[PDB]
Structure 1
Amino acid sequence: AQYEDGKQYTTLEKPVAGAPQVLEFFSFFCPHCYQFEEVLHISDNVKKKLPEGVKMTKYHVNFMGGDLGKDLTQAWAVAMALGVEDKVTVPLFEGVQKTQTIRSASDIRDVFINAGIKGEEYDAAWNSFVVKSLVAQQEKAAADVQLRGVPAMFVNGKYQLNPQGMDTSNMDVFVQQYADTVKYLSEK
């Protein structure tokens, strides 16, 4: 066929029931994730080709950057709770990987303060049990799929994108091929 298991994707031998339709994992420590977000805008271009009625989920993982990685998973939980994903994603990436000004929870917090979230509001979210189960969710979802590397995308708990198997000579072509694949997987 044109889309083959082992080529543009792989199939999980143990499928994950009740999984988000389109589930994406990343880490602010992950260099390819930085590319996926800042240069390629993968999440966005995928959304642009998805059907109607399909929900797009993105979770952070712990297994990169030790203590700060875990902190960053709680902060993404806060970001999700407050709905400020789009106002912190870029400064978080650039503070971890570009400028290297993120070294502690407190620096993570500064990014939110600078993005206009109120101190009070952030600290309350950070400590809320609405944030704890959102952290738990992020962990559960990764655990459910044997996650050992990012970036990673899963479709209907059953298919995992394989970007390694797509051409990378042209960035735009890589993205559309990536997105078209998710669409195909989506319809399968």
Structure 2
Amino acid sequence: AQYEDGKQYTTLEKPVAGAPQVLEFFSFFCPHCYQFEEVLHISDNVKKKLPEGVKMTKYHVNFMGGDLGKDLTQAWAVAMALGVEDKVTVPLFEGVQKTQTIRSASDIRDVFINAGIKGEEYDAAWNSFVVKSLVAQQEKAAADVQLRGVPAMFVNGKYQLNPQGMDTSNMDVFVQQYADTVKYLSEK
């Protein structure tokens, strides 16, 4: 077939009931994730190829970056709780990988302050049980699939995108193949 298990996608030997329709995992330490955000715009190009109103979910992971990796998962929980993901994603990626100015939880907080989140609101969220629950939710989603590596995308709790099997000579051809694969998997 044109789409084959092992080529554009793989199939989970233990499928995950109840998972979000489109679920992405990333780390602010991950070099491909940086490109998926700033240069390839993978999430938006997938969204535009799926029907209106489909749920897409994006979670951070702990396994890169030690202490700061876990701090970034908690900050991503804050960003989700406050609905400011679009305001902090690029400065967090650049602070971790480009300028390397993010070395502590305090440096992470500065990114939110610079983006216009008030300090009192950041701190209240950071320490809230709503955020502790969002951290647990991110861990649980990743654990369900013994998540190996990022960037990872899962479709309907059943299929995992395989970007290693896609074109790499042209950025836009790769993005197109990736998004068309998501569409194909969503229609299975």
The alignment covers a number of residue pairs equal to: 188
TM-fit CA distance, 1:51: 1.4
How far, CA to CA, are the matches of 1:16 and 1:145 in structure 2? 8
User: Paired residue for 2:31?
Assistant: 31
Give ranges in structure 1 of 5+ residues lacking alignment.
Answer: none
Q: TM-score, normalised by structure 1?
A: 0.99
Any idea what SS the aligned residue of 2:49 has?
Answer: coil
TM-fit CA distance, 1:53: 3.6
How far, CA to CA, are the matches of 2:19 and 2:160 in structure 1? 13
How far, CA to CA, are the matches of 1:3 and 1:67 in structure 2? 40
Provide Cα deviations, 1:83-116, integer angstroms capped at 9, x if missing partner: 0000000000000000000000000000000000
Deviates more, 1:68-77 or 1:48-57: 48-57
Give the 4+ runs in structure 1 shifted more than 4 A.
none
Provide Cα deviations, 1:143-176, integer angstroms capped at 9, x if missing partner: 0011010000000000000000001100000001
Provide Cα deviations, 1:24-61, integer angstroms capped at 9, x if missing partner: 00000001100111110001100011113410000000
User: Paired residue for 1:90?
Assistant: 90
Superposed CA RMSD in Å reads: 0.5
How far, CA to CA, are the matches of 1:141 and 1:164 in structure 2? 23
Q: How do 1:99-118 and structure 2 match up within 5 A? A: 99-118=99-118
Deviates more, 1:51-60 or 1:130-139: 51-60
- Percent identity over the alignment is 100
Give ranges in structure 2 of 5+ residues lacking alignment.
Answer: none
Any idea what SS the aligned residue of 1:59 has?
Answer: strand
User: Paired residue for 1:180?
Assistant: 180
How far, CA to CA, are the matches of 1:93 and 1:162 in structure 2? 23
